[PDB]
From a paper:
The UbiD family of reversible (de)carboxylases depends on the recently discovered prenylated-FMN (prFMN) cofactor for activity. Here, we show that the Pseudomonas aeruginosa virulence attenuation factor PA0254/HudA is a pyrrole-2-carboxylic acid decarboxylase. We here report that the UbiD-like Pseudomonas aeruginosa virulence attenuation factor PA0254/HudA is a close homologue of Bacillus megaterium PYR2910 pyrrole-2-carboxylate (P2C) decarboxylase and show that PA0254 is capable of prFMN-dependent decarboxylation of P2C as well as carboxylation of pyrrole. Together with computational studies, our data suggests prFMN covalent catalysis occurs via electrophilic aromatic substitution and links HudA activity with the inhibitory effects of pyrrole-2-carboxylic acid on P. aeruginosa quorum sensing.
A number of PA0254 variants were generated in order to establish the proposed role of N318 in substrate recognition. In the case of HmfF, the corresponding residue is H297, which was established to be key to ensuring specificity for furan-type substrates. Hence, we designed a PA0235 N318H variant to test whether this would affect the substrate specificity and possibly alter the preference to furan-type substrates. Structure determination of the N318H variant revealed that the introduced histidine side chain partially occupies the site of the prenyl-derived fourth prFMN ring, preventing prFMN binding.
Author numbering:
A (entry chain C): -2 to 496
B (entry chain B): 1 to 496
Write the structure that this text describes.
């Protein structure tokens, strides 16, 4: 119980804790960062195997390690989310709802500022100027048709508004360009893109750092679409109940977590670019052609002894673009909806849907008082959700009554198949602007910048009057409470035991 | 194992030998308790329960719950279903579909008529008929009555004797020798019975309960009109089904059936039947008048086993049997019509409310068409068939995904269906009347619930694909995939 709480704030301890859970495999065989690491980890995601810690990567800095699947799922269904739950210090049986509830409580708690320290483990090794050689690290080629090797797939950028009011921590990919330059996207609706654009009106480049192997709770928050201007570091402290220990970078004054595995520092160039990508991505596809992206100059880097580089091998679910990102989006969307007065009691970005839809659980004993109907409700939800920072990331919304558990894909499918009426429940919103990464967009959607948004209504019409056409024929809903308890009571005595 | 396909009692014994059967010796109430246990068995994917000690029931009589439920062990999940066809425990949807389709291509093997058989060990005639002596369950709390037949099939015969039809249909208990159940006019029972209404006499009928599992499966299969189920079963298992004559009306039933009911379907007598939890997962509140089935005689084996199906949320036998049979029949219909379809699957999770069509991407381009035209073509062919009429929604997706895996179907629905281009409603095509989302407008018009969801990217109709799949199988060369599989144990995973 103590090991779990230290796991939230210490990546190295997090890894040791995974091993104690039996959720880590120590790979001592020599492995090739050219595709092999990426292949092993992909198979780990899809088999829901323990996270691999790679101890020996060919042609890499001696002692350097790689952690694959830092928040992959486990095969054991009772502990399937334990690796993700451990990012917040939660026990192994924690599930989606437990994680979301804790993420929301931290939103309403006052931030706990980071504790500034003079020294930290991240400073045990410092490479300055000409010592910087990113190619010495075990930088993987993650997919066969990738456009380059990716240094940052599981770290977050650290930048600061010029006025010093807003400390932004955000996860974004960074491709390896040469020994001291990286390149990665800065979509204008993400917070790095906004602050970076705050520096272009000052004639200066953006001072920048990236933390890799950062405190797991800090990494999760960096992958969370918190509202604009909100500092991620204070939300992490509030989430774990104590400040995140930080130190100053070696060359630009930004504060990064003190026990980070690897810290990069430099600046984001104002107009230099390099062809970046393509890369297998969260939607599950590898698109064929890359795009020019801003260059990240690395003036210095520091790392702990025997540094662990965590990676994410993006693709078909479930990987960290779903377990981390989708989870964080779900909790933010729940807060967005409830704050707007919408009758939503849970939101879940089904991992199986590759973070391309969110299922909203509708409190049916609140629906009647709205005096509305499917078409009006869908439009109201669309404006509210899609207009939020978190809701902008997700193109499809499914609305269903809270009689189903929206975290269970089988129940969501049951509701889609049996409740969505083909003529009445398909609400496209072609005027709402799209998130540009949605894989089914066509040339026309990309020219207008909209066309991909959808609300699928699974609320029967009578539910807007507080009624329901039929009861559910299931164990829970087709038998009286006294009989259900008797069956649950005697289950083992009938002869079933644990099955 | 092939014994199991032709012998319900051996099938039960085979399940126990597999470790897939729980013998319940605790006394249980057929009033709701048996249904509640079995419903939980479906949802937990537990072993099939055999109830030996049924309160208030005929001595020696037993009840088999979840005869075709799924198992928690994912490697053997479909073993109980597969054993209906004599297939091994690791058989999956595709193996089952392939075998059901080979059976369509073999010529039928007529049943072998015997004069004696185990089903005749006990005979009740006329006033001996007391259906209430059997462990007739009340399956759901709000059900309209107790159901004797949830896992048996009607046996009727054309007046010409050209067509012996076996069809699964529910039968509610009305009184000690009368039952009532639906005979929807598009089903084959309703067509043959309404051929008898043109004759002056009622429809002679029998129901086999605890029949040979292979016969039960076929009876739950929408084979074309005029096709005799019994001959298809023989072709499926490779040998005739042994059948004997009924004791009182000359209809022929399988010889080792657990329980055989005999009588006739009255022309115009009805009784308020239902409601009952149904395949779509819902219990609607009000019943309907349905034809009365008069039971003049019945026969059963010593210590008879009454199989039951507790309809509701998936997966139960309305999905594992019915859905599977529909999928195989739909694959045949589609391929016979020339559609470029290589697999069809009625996802159990969708409660037999949608069918996923796996599109052979290498044949699509030669059609020179597009999503709208293809969807309309698929709609006409599929919904127009006997099997396709049962399913209101079709999903078309390329065969790069495994359409039997709901996680992959969901990935495709979410990442390939464009909200503006891929939602093809067909409000003019007649509906299957049980579809739960129909409104008053559809039930008065007789149509409005049909839909085709297109998950084929537009470039696929030209034989192209916008992007490769980022997965282990599709993002790495074959040699690396082999090396990772070979050295998996060296890495430290050991069966992970
Ligand atoms: C492993 C992982 C990788 C991610 N990579 C990217 C990325 O490359 N580009 C991007 O725009 N968002 C990416 N995200 C999502 C962002 O981290 C997320 O939207 C976050 O809210 C951004 O922070 P911000 O709200 O301060 O902009 C990733 C998330 C995770 C979990
Ligand atoms: C367990 C089970 C129960 C079924 N119950 C019914 C039913 O009550 N009413 C009905 O119309 N069809 C029911 N069916 C569907 C029929 O068995 C199926 O449509 C079959 O093809 C009918 O035979 P037919 O083609 O000769 O009409 C059931 C199927 C199964 C597997
Ligand atoms: Mn932010
Ligand atoms: Mn038939
Ligand atoms: Na963030
Ligand atoms: Na049939």
């Amino acid at each position: 119980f103590q090991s779990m709480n230290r796991s939230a704030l210490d990546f190295r301890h997090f890894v040791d804790h995974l091993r104690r859970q039996g959720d880590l495999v120590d790979v001592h065989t020599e492995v090739d960062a050219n595709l092999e690491i990426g292949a092993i980890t992909r198979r780990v995601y899809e088999r829901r195997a323990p996270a691999p810690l790679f101890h020996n990567i060919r042609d890499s800095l001696p002692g350097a390690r790689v952690l694959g699947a830092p928040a992959g799922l486990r095969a054991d269904r009772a502990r399937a989310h334990s690796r993700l739950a451990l990012h917040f210090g939660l026990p192994e049986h924690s599930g989606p709802r437990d994680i979301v509830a804790m993420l929301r409580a931290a939103m309403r708690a006052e931030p706990i500022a980071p504790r500034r320290l003079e020294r930290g483990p991240v400073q045990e090794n410092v490479w300055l100027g000409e010592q910087v050689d990113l190619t010495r690290f075990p930088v993987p080629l993650l997919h066969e048709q990738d456009g380059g090797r990716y240094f940052g797939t599981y770290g977050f950028h650290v930048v600061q508004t010029p006025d010093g009011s807003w400390d932004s921590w955000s996860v974004g990919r960074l491709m390896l360009v040469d020994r001291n330059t990286l390149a990665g996207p800065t979509i204008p609706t993400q917070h790095i893109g906004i602050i970076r654009e705050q520096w272009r009106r000052l004639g200066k480049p953006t001072p920048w750092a990236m933390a890799l192997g950062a405190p797991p709770a800090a990494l999760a928050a960096a992958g969370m679409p918190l509202p604009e201007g909100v500092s991620e570091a204070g939300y992490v402290g509030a989430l774990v109940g104590e400040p995140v220990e930080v130190v100053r970078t070696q060359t630009n004054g930004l504060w990064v977590p003190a026990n980070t595995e690897i810290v990069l520092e430099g600046e984001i160039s104002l107009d230099e670019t390099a062809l970046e990508g393509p890369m297998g991505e969260y939607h599950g596809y590898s698109f064929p052609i890359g795009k020019p992206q801003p260059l990240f100059h690395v003036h210095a880097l520091s790392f702990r002894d025997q540094p662990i580089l965590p990676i994410c091998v993006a693709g078909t679910p479930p990987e960290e673009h779903h377990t981390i990102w989708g989870t964080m989006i779900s909790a933010q969307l729940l807060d967005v909806a409830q704050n707007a007065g919408l009758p939503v009691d849970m939101v879940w970005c089904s991992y199986e849907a590759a973070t391309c839809w969110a299922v909203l659980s509708i409190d049916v004993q609140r629906l009647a008082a709205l005096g509305t109907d499917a078409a009006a409700f869908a439009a109201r939800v669309a404006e509210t959700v899609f207009g939020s920072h978190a809701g902008h990331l997700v193109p499809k919304l499914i609305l269903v009554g809270n009689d189903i558990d929206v975290t269970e894909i089988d129940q969501v499918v049951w509701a889609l198949a049996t409740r969505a009426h083909p003529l009445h429940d398909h609400f496209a919103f072609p005027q709402i602007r799209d998130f540009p990464m949605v894989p089914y967009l066509d040339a026309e959607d990309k020219a207008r910048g909209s066309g991909g948004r959808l609300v699928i209504n699974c609320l029967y019409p009578e539910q807007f009057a507080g009624q329901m056409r039929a009861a559910t024929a299931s164990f829970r809903h087709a038998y009286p409470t006294a009989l259900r308890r008797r069956v649950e009571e005697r289950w083992s005595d009938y002869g079933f035991g644990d099955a």
